[model samples]
Target: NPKETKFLEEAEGVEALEWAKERTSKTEKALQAMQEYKQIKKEIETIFYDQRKTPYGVIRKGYVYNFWMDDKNPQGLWRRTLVDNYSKDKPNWEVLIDFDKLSKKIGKKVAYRGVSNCFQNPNRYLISMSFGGKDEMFFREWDLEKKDFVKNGFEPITNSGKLLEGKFTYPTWINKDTIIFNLVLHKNEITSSLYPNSLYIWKRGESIEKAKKLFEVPKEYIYVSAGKLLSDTISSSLIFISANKDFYNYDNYILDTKYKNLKLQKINMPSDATLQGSFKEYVFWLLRSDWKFKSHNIKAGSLVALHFTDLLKTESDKTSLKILFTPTANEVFNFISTTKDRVFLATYDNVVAKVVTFTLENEQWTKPVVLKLPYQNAIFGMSSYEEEEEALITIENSIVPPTIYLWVKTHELKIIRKALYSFDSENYVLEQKEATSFDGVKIPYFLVYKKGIKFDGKNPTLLEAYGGFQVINAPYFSRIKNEVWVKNAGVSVLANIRGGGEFGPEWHKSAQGIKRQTAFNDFFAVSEELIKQNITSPEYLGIKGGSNGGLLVSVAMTQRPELFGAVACEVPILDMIRYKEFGAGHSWVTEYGDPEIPNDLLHIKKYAPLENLSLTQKYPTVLITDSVLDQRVHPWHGRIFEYVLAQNPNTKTYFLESKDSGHGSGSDLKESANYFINLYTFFANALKLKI
Candidate 1:
């Protein structure tokens, strides 16, 4: 059994690797004509080449730091520019790290993970590097002044065996000399899920063996991690260490910098409540469920704040807390970011985003002031630093291109940069539609098509959805959808299925665990509604998704293959029976049921794509993609699906196993463009679009 399973699942053996390559090569050869089309080349030019002119960076210490990529340096260039100069027609940028050159020197495709600056001195930074765009990466300390790696500074050992490495939650700067983060102390110091279960206090010039251990959780816990410095105005800094039980439940503790006994005091709050952030001594929290906090009953979507000092106080002092923001029936708190003197809160009201800023003065919070944007219902995100008063808001939607604006001095909004127009917005139509599911539950979806297109049920269409993990499938701008698909007379649809957080926790909970079939039903309902409206016929309907969305379409291919013409599943999980045995699949037991248990397996078996796929059924043209470097979802999922489907001569199944990329879009521009080219080209050919 072991020999058979390894032969079928393992990606490294010479035989299996060559077999996968052959499958991929054959598929690429079949799609050669579509790939070579003039429209596809134009899409790559307009989307990536023209996109490089736009300024993309993050603001820190009055300077804008960017990791930019283009045709010249496909990997990226870590550079910086002054905040004032960043807005000029052509800002002068100082290159810090040329990742393309570094990649050549290192002999690995190194990708930027993130950068953490030392709070004591903003110039010193901790740079995270990922090889071949994998989630597992190592960290090194860099000095802005020296423009190079710091000598005798922080650098985690790579391939040392002593330290277990995976996806690192960015480490916190306790001081210039020390930092707190999750670390696998020894060979066996990892959880069953393969994540670090110990929190460490690593110091400057200290090796992994010499770093002081702070605290550790039981191996059954998912991971033990720390976060950014949550500071009060009095210059006092505190950080939170969390022990995750699973994907959703966490036991949080506040670590005082003084390390008065090096003890972590447990913060008494609901395990599922979200830590919005901290401003001064007050720490904000967003309730995921109704809570009776002190004397008041806070609703599930309410935002409340309590003083940081309250956790240390007696049980007698637990008399009150301040409610900051409460949502109406149609709204839910999306996110929160803080600057020096203000807190910015973002909320989605009926899937429309709104921003409000709050200021605390004289020990009393000011009324929330709405930040008016030029457009309504645009999906927007904001970034801010505690040291600066200004913040940046990026707004974009399906038809509109991205435009970055600076929230200046808590007042005026200044346009920093706008992306080039790859496709004409006026040539398309974007509309929100609803469909009734099997249970009579209404599901909302966004549809975009060329203006004055015939609804003759023969148009090429691509339907996409991610129906799990409380992730909102927002209608952000997609260059591939606009240029490659819609501009070429194809239709695009985004299904806001039940499992997403578009409405709230209830929306997500409704499709979780054994009720997971509801999400599939919701997706099917949207597909059927599109067909009912004569938008596209089965021969012209294509569906594409990655990760969770991949699982959705995989299920669609197996459970209801007649509903779709083509399927593009990227980094998908198909075998629920063996999922927990690989990668980070153990962390997702809360969303999808645990197959080890009999009752849960019974429900999961009903829709598990691998088991459900039958040779008796005529399947659609399917293309499955996976990467050997993908550490999140194992490539076995795609391999097993493709291997099984390849058996039936009636089913057209193709497999693409990437040697250079991982779970995300990719590490660089060319890698990303190549992926879109493959995806859209497959859709174009299978759906018979005359591009």
Candidate 2:
């Protein structure tokens, strides 16, 4: 009985894995003879291993730090170079740590999670690493000058000479000699969500057991986190702590460090409002709902600020709060960052990307100044330091290869790097189009296709949509997608449906909780419009998605099987009825209604993929893939979905569970390349593509 229960719980037994291998063998062998596959594989290798072809590095002070990956060092190598040297064709990089070499020495596969450095002493850092690619990570202090770990630094030890590790073990530096952190030194140091619940203050050259207990949160809370904020208008760094009740709700407090008792002053702000960051003595706040301040009304999704000294006041002057930026109907702030003297932001206007900056001159915030970019209708990533005025930003789209730019606070911006082209971009074109959904709502979508393509309804087209978490599905560059699909005359479409932030909070609010099916209806409308427009027929259309997107594709395959020829669902949450019982699923009940309630279960069962899979209905071919090491969404979701789908002898389904990658991305370049190759090859055969 125990063995049977274990089989049901895991569903990753030899029988299922063997079935996956047997089903995928034919497509794998067919790719061996195709010249296009060979070319795509080589291009992928060049994209990953070619020197100076493309390199992404972060700037700190005057140096650029990068994590490099290649065939030799599949794990990665943390290296650094001067900012001036990075602009050259071949920068001389000084390697700081070799993860592959360390893996060989420690006999454990290691991954570089992140690093926390002291603002006062930048050379001292706390390096976080994970064995394999799980959520939990172990920390160690390292000295930049010594190029090695510091002696008697912070490393939690267990009874068996093992390193202490936890999922949310974040450490932020308060000073060179002391740090405020949250680590799982005891088994009871976690919340019901399995996140760190206790905070500690550790001193130099002391065992973890000697660290003083700083604070503790209730176990029922979702999680607790603490971090230090640097301000140019203040003499010392201020530490802030938060206790989250759900995904978007939390209470924040500022720690009173000067007091011997170390009291915490609860910040006077709406619980739903976010503490963006601090600049000088001003603390920025983002409102998720309307706030009434004196006679002024601050709307949701607006960025505002107030002085930190007034945050602890019981009856602070409400009029001192300033509204920095307000959103229009088509605009929403994507991210906010600060330097010593200025605040920088990224925003999307009707899904078009733009960067804006503001300066605090004479105690007044300046008007927003939009930065110049190489192209429009694209997305970008930005990085800045609180101590420096220089920032690095990368811009790209589906057709445009990435271009890195360096922007300084003095209004000087220039391109620093241009990636090599992967395909002949002149032959293709990008277009923005709209589709009317079931409720007569117009849904926007982006389409990339060859210029001279016909409207014969025979083209092989792939559509993707992720309609949850208020995440904006931005336009990004993918060399593999361009090489394998676009260059081969195939069309690709990105659907900006509801449950996303494309149009702002209102767009996401339209498809949440009981109205979750609104997003799915939007996706189906896109598919219908594409077919009606003669871009592609049902037999030639393939749909793909991962994570929440995986759930999207699965629901589509079951609810509208005639709309797609094949489905690629990776790391999905299929069983919505019991999702809260799995890994990290309890925290998402705010997004997906809790099925334990009778009314919620009635609505969830209407679209839940696992509950809807039936033997009576014919289904499209699907390839469900997940990773054994993925801790965000349990692999059981994929395993059981494939098992149940296989019950219908006519329905074709394949499953792959890799041991390498985690949830979002693969751990290494080679693994990433191989995974893409498999995905596209399966798509090629299923949709009967020319490639």
Candidate 3:
């Protein structure tokens, strides 16, 4: 059993919830009393419902399908329109399914999860729904042409949805005849089962239990997932199954769908590299570490390819695979996309994105030709490989509002549209700089500030970072940051610290396990550099992060209480020692080491914000926030941290436990605005910033 805890040990129980209620009320009263809170609310409401805001989504052949929300349709709308008219001003749209209308008719709230459709029969789709932003989902078969829901739709075969935390389900269509999905076999933290064991195959109209069993594996494995690759050349779909050892390492297998029985084959490669995707007679591999095969040496962070038909035989030698492209130290392969007969590679050199296309000729890839995108900015994401040839990509940065680009051809890109912006650039500046970490590693950070500001160490600044799970925390435009923070002479910084996939997997692994201290150290190093450079002093520096980032800032405050002026930890994971005992905590054992292990638990205590905050020194004011329905990262992470701080008379702590939202603060636009109001109001009041 774990060590005894206080306040939030029974995280979802009645007594702890009562504690959250008292803290929430206290923060609300204080937040509302701030004069800046009223102005922030009024300013955000205008931007939240702006009519000209850009709509982003999937681009089908003839239609641009999107999910949108406004005061008119708060729950949301699944609508579509002519693909060619997407860039036009207020193009005509056909309401496919009005979620608000359906909610009113059924007397229940529905949040649209996502849509999946068969490639051959695209008009029919399986639409997933979450009730009031909870994990328990209801899947419905939707008919686009008929504009209606199908009765007795394809549903999840397993999962009891016990404790209000449903399965992490991802159902996909293999064709018009069958659907493949994984269910929560062991359900929550304490539950135990293997990854491949949860997958099931079902033909349309068959009872889920009666469906054929596809695959199963040993429980020793950490996790597993399946990927379906549709190729025009291969005709039949191919299945990719990966048995995960941890978050980064996986033993991959390629199964031939033409065979009636599923079989596993060991792939040829090192444990560190990743299997990206498979397409027309080729399987793609992105190397996370250097690989040596006979005479060929594939450098780390390179995108390479193999002869799929030869590589699948379980007899082919190392000659079957070849490296497609390698990146420099400052560059990394970000994403890849495939068309009928071509391959596209998206790379980030010095953090700026460039896309290049290649073709196969005489058993090798030809030289790449860069696509002339009409702008210069970071390409955030490419459309999934599942998308059509002319899929859409999103591009933006701190100064630039996001714009969409269409991969019209290998040599060209078409701008679909750009987001509307109201900020005047003359009053501000954007810059990227590097800071020296404690270990001499150069960390990159972005800084935005008002023009003509002197380096006098007194700027209202906010710092944010997410330093785990290999998550790509790239630069993106924030409308509120520009209007609410920058417009008022406040500066903001986004530091790319260790543990993120800024460079690649090695960048992430360098800070995991016992090395996790590297991440915390990098965060502090950047804070020190900011103050030393006179950008912002410790008295005016406020830090903010959610989830993993939340845990980062909290540990920062506990480790060095004098470095920050204010701290906002939202939906955090703070009590590291007993984390695996509650909620979906055990699921993240890969990202963090297992606390049940003796060494892991003892080492974790050094950074556990809840454990370290019992101090005598006066620390910065702390504001913690969480959702009542957040089963992902239990609200207890915040509650227990706040409880520890409040116990010390010298500690200043505040909280706001929102009523009905999951890991993400409510999906409603206005609800999101209110959350920001509470967060920024706390920072303003603590740091004494004038609005």
Candidate 4:
């Protein structure tokens, strides 16, 4: 079938792999030998492999558990230290499991997925392990105290040494001796397109055949998963049932565990509502739409609590729900965390994060206490204190360094740890600027540049934005980023556009479905404004994005080829019409309209990256990257798109299909850093900029 049809083979079949090998070799020969790339890469490696790096830890039962990976140990090491010791400069960390040491013995590229434990015995962990960083991984029960995998652990450790064969085959601990998980029935079966629709309960040491069939969802549903949650104070247990269409709508149910035959009693609530937390008789609901409870109107995007027991009393006489927190016009509540008595609500207003705690006593809610944070750019919370209830907030901005603060109560925040950021505010400045979109809407963007940068239109600028699935705002730090991009005297711009959650639900839906063009137009507006202001010209202006953002930049490169100098589309979904045929494609039908449907196809055809691209046009230098191991967006999208682009003599297509990574970064630091090296190398070449 030649290059045009080469991608039609198995996603990672041998024929396809050899083609990838040729592409990888071709790209490496061109980019790897550059002197600028070597210095840029070595400098980034110093930052990445720094042994004195901040040990990012999560608290579990007063222990600061963290995973460490670096120059010596590339795979990683799971270790823990007491909470008190973590703040000290020389904290003693006890290594629980050294993945590098074990992977060498086991002879498999082990990617530690996560550790799951039951409340009954927090020391026992159902450790999820992935081979070569694929989505599928096996759950091995490891004794935290004993520091070894239990002899007869969780699943079927097959005679053939096969691991679990699906993503999210996680051992969701339900009780001391039992776990609920999702996995394929047989070994070596391709998941393809279909998300898991079944849940099986496996008792400790129970054979796969003997594992009880608790319940299963309709196969037609996009995804189905469940987990158990119990609050000792409530004296009641809850098991969440997440079923169907993406995340927007799902049916949740409370499991009747007391009964011999476990039955799921569906809670009558809005489909879009998600469970926040629960205590005593009160169950929390985070609303995506306005819910009317007994003639009282609750606003949309509000956190409300309902007495589960009261709702069960009478369906007709239900006045049990009470509003806990409501968002202002620009503010939205997300990221719920809880303890036995306190519910932590994270609100983002005007793209700045604030955590508010609501304590419960005697079925009544106390006034919410807002947790004060350091300078506001964006604060990412590590945990929602469930055990004895603790909260950790970390603040890192486009300019300010990162500081992890322990929210000890109300606003008593203690500086637990810090990482030295490698940038000076005196040398550079960050400005929150806005550009008028094509539709007269104002789109916000963060523009960072040196103080003395001239408006000569020759400045090397990199513009980026993820304008889909309610995820708009992205903060840039010269420290977090390799800094070599900015080290080259380049300006960085992060555009907060539509089809993202910048301003809330309405802001996201503004560019949804047929209105997707609105996001593209908004992106172009920012690019044009940069040129008009003489901050950067089309010759020096480059754009980068991945996944949804990848499609965003690809569209920009194709639509206005004359405007951009470089393009990096990573792990992108290019062919809208055929996307549903690949991995977990059915899961995203809610976000991207169903391409097979007649009306949906009509609108999708107008802007879908692959279909709209032409063979005759000269596009900007495009470096297309995809993972054969990618769980969601298929690598074929990149393969075929590159083929189409390369068919044109003018297109500079640099494509790589990696074996070690999935949706995001690679398995080890080496692969991850190399990806950035290749990227920045291409960008520098395209922009004609150097250190």
- List TM-score per model, in order: 0.96, 0.94, 0.92, 0.94
Stretches of model 2 off by over 4 angstroms after superposition: 1-8, 11-40, 231-236, 314-316
Best by TM-score: 1
lDDT of 2 by residue, 71-99 (tens): 88888899999999988878899999999
Model 3 CA lDDT for position 659: 70
Query: What local distance difference test score does each model get?
Result: 0.80, 0.79, 0.74, 0.76
lDDT of 1 by residue, 486-602 (tens): 888899999989888887888899999888899999999999999999999899999988998888999888888889999999988777888888888888899888999999999
Deviation of model 2 at 292, angstroms? 2.6
Candidate 3 structure, TM-score to reference: 0.92
Best by lDDT: 1
Model 1 is weakest, by summed lDDT over 10 consecutive residues, at: 228-237
Summing lDDT over every window of 10 consecutive residues in candidate 4, give the lowest-scoring window: 186-195
lDDT of 4: 0.76
